[model samples]
Target: HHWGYGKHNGPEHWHKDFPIAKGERQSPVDIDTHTAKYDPSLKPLSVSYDQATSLRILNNGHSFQVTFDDSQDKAVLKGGPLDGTYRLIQFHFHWGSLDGQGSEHTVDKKKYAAELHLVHWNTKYGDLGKAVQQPDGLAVLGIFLKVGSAKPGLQKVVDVLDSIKTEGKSADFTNFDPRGLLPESLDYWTYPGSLTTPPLLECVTWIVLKEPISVSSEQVLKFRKLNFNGEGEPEELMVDNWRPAQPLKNRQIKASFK
Candidate 1:
């Protein structure tokens, strides 16, 4: 069985195949704000995305993903916990259903409605597979989304939900500024962690923002409408696609701002 958010196939059961599920530097740790240290040397993250790099949006069975043209460094994230320029490869979301709180990385054990992840690959690694194996090969910008007023940027994606309602469904998405989806404040917490999905590779440098963006409840409903199963098989609504907080172990969590 494939890894999913179900009890039998959930994070708890993932180690059978991918032993790294319990490895050091696991992700979605509970970010204890009081304990997070202030690092003066950590510079402000410079994130610049070209709307033209927006390529396509699709249902990856796990989440709604928007891929970018990483052929060039037009969309790059640098500074702050990064040593090399990382090219934006894709962005996706993790959310909870009506029954549970959705956000992955919690603030002082608090959960938000959802979490957005912008995935980038370190150019120095040469290729994606190589980058994915290196400890610093990937950098993900994690933005929390709370239920509140509608966000125009989020709404744009919501409007297209009907087009890609099933797994493997995708549509051309152009000129969409992924930066607009970020919170105004860039203040955040940084840590060394792994991908929160299957394989759970310890290749990500996690930069989780303190400020959250807003998405109305209606917009969340649109996200829930997407099906994990393709058109033929039984219908399974894609929800509660978030992993719970894992043990911090011995890793440190630092803040970009004091």
Candidate 2:
């Protein structure tokens, strides 16, 4: 029977609940990491990214989702993330109990502690909220999170968790700069997939970075303090808010440079 929700749920189970989900692509799962030598046959789409004016942070008690209203840069994935031009919409995270072990996307069956998803939309399709339902309407950058020697750009958001420490409580951040949290490299693993959530449409071009960024143990601990039921109730803290790994099925993960 289906037993999880959002990302923690498995691929097979999701389809069990939503039959249409059967044909849709799932995320944070294993995909054949295409490592064979191939041609540079695939061209990348040009993109532009602008800093967001305001960032709306919502604490759904499940996790924190940061929404950006204005951005000035976009990338052309060629046959990838952007078909023509897409706008950066919102980005969020899926994390686990500790700093070393919360991410969903696995490698050789090894899991990370946290993952960040930077979701975008094709202007050719429409706004992300609208385009997310359409196949070929979304592109998500999946960044693996690991405990490392350097600092992660994620501190900007993690530092704010205490404010909206309860479910349904949200904090507004104005004059936001979204890119400061991004990693130094744009290198990624690309594939076609669907939203990690319900509907699970096979409509996303996923770019997963090979290199993971670092976050301090203290910062990760903050996520552990969250509660899907709300604050102080202690039903179950969102300690491990990660989706278990999914099957690659028939999909392939392509890299930009091998």
Candidate 3:
């Protein structure tokens, strides 16, 4: 709980407590379009969701996440750089105070308005906690959100915001397929990276979609309405919930298409 986007405890100070924050394969790296190599061997990513599996939406004082039932693979991610199927557990977003720049990973230094992270775990390990320790354990599918027409898939998500305005507040969220929120193309850039937040575990296989989804400024502002502070605490806004892009280090970002 000591870690947050505060002036003193932000991303810069994270390396002090979570030493792995400085590790080689850190997350939220900038995607250099000119250098990304085309990988002919990569497969098109596949994802399917069961609306019934969506359980609840909660605000953990960090970001609002819509959780899914993972008792089985009702909602799962497959193909792309992965060798096995990954089970969908939860999905959350990171955004800025306004609409200018908010996403975690940027393209050629161009930041988007927001970012979506759909977290999944491989079935081989059978448990998220177990998989988080393995390098090949997690697959986080990312989507960049640019301002445009309101997305249909996003309407339901934002509508529930009024219910969970404080930390730890959660409400029933169901019958929503996240697939509707995705862009038309499945083209992506794949790499090995860690969780953007602390303890900053380095177990994620990141697949960020090349095409961005649309979100109007009005829709984005609704996200700003939530409180980063918990119930009974002074109301603080949740904005700039993203980490700056890390050094590319020794990794190569592979493109799924030419």
Candidate 4:
């Protein structure tokens, strides 16, 4: 048995197979602004996402992902505790069945209705696979989603959900600017962490935004309509697809804003 969201194989049991689940720099840690160190030297994050770079969206049994063509440097992230340009490859979301609880990373022990992860790989490694196994491989931008006004530029993504409602289903998604989904502020907290999923590679440098993006309740619920099963299989609602906050251990969290 690999890993899943069931009672028998969820996060609590992942450490049995992946011992690194108990590692020092695990992700989704509870961020306390009062305790975080404000680093004046941290640069503002530079995000350059081309609307034409978005290729397609897929429901991969866990979460729906909007993948981008990264053959070139059309979309990349730099600054904010990162060394080199990290090319954007894909973006995904994690949510819950209800509006009160869904996000993977929390602030002051508070959870958001959902969360977005923009996954990028350091271009120095040439490819994502090789970068995944290295210490400075991945850069994941984490954005919290709160219930309010529906986020601008997100409807384009939400409109395609029905087409990929089942596992392994995908459809063409294009001409969408991923940057529109970001908040007005780029202030964030950076820390060394691992992937929140199986094969939990300790390569991600998490940049979680302090401000949250707004989404109406209806917009957030649409994500729950997705199923973990493929067509013809027993349907399973894909809600609460997030990992719990892990121990901070001895790691230091650096904040970009005062």
Q: How many clashes does each candidate structure show, in the order listed?
A: 0, 24, 0, 0
TM-score of each: 0.97, 0.83, 0.97, 0.97
TM-score: which candidate is best?
3
lDDT of 3 at 234: 86
lDDT score, residue 2, model 4? 48
14-75 per-residue lDDT for model 4 (tens digits): 98999999898898899987888899999999888763398889999989999998898889
Candidate 2 lDDT, 116-214, residue by residue in tens: 887777677546666777777877777877766545456667788878776777888755565665566665667777777665666687777767777
Best by lDDT: 3
Off by over 4 Å in 4: none
Report, for every candidate in turn, its global Cα lDDT versus the true structure.
Answer: 0.90, 0.65, 0.91, 0.91
Q: Which residue runs does candidate 2 get wrong by more than 4 Å?
A: 1-13, 31-39, 43-47, 70-81, 149-152, 231-234
User: In candidate 1, what residue range of length 10 has the lowest lDDT sum?
Assistant: 46-55
**Candidate 3: misplaced stretches above 4 Å?**
50-52
RMSD over all Cα atoms, model 3: 1.0
Tens-digit per-residue lDDT, 62-140, candidate 1: 9999988898888999998889899998999998886248899999898988999999999999878999999999999
Which regions of candidate 1 fall more than 4 Å away from where they truly are? Answer: none
Of the two candidates 2 and 3, the one with more favorable TM-score, higher being better, is 3
- State the RMSD for candidate 1: 1.3
Error of 2 at 179 (Å): 1.4
The residue pairs in collision within model 3 are: none
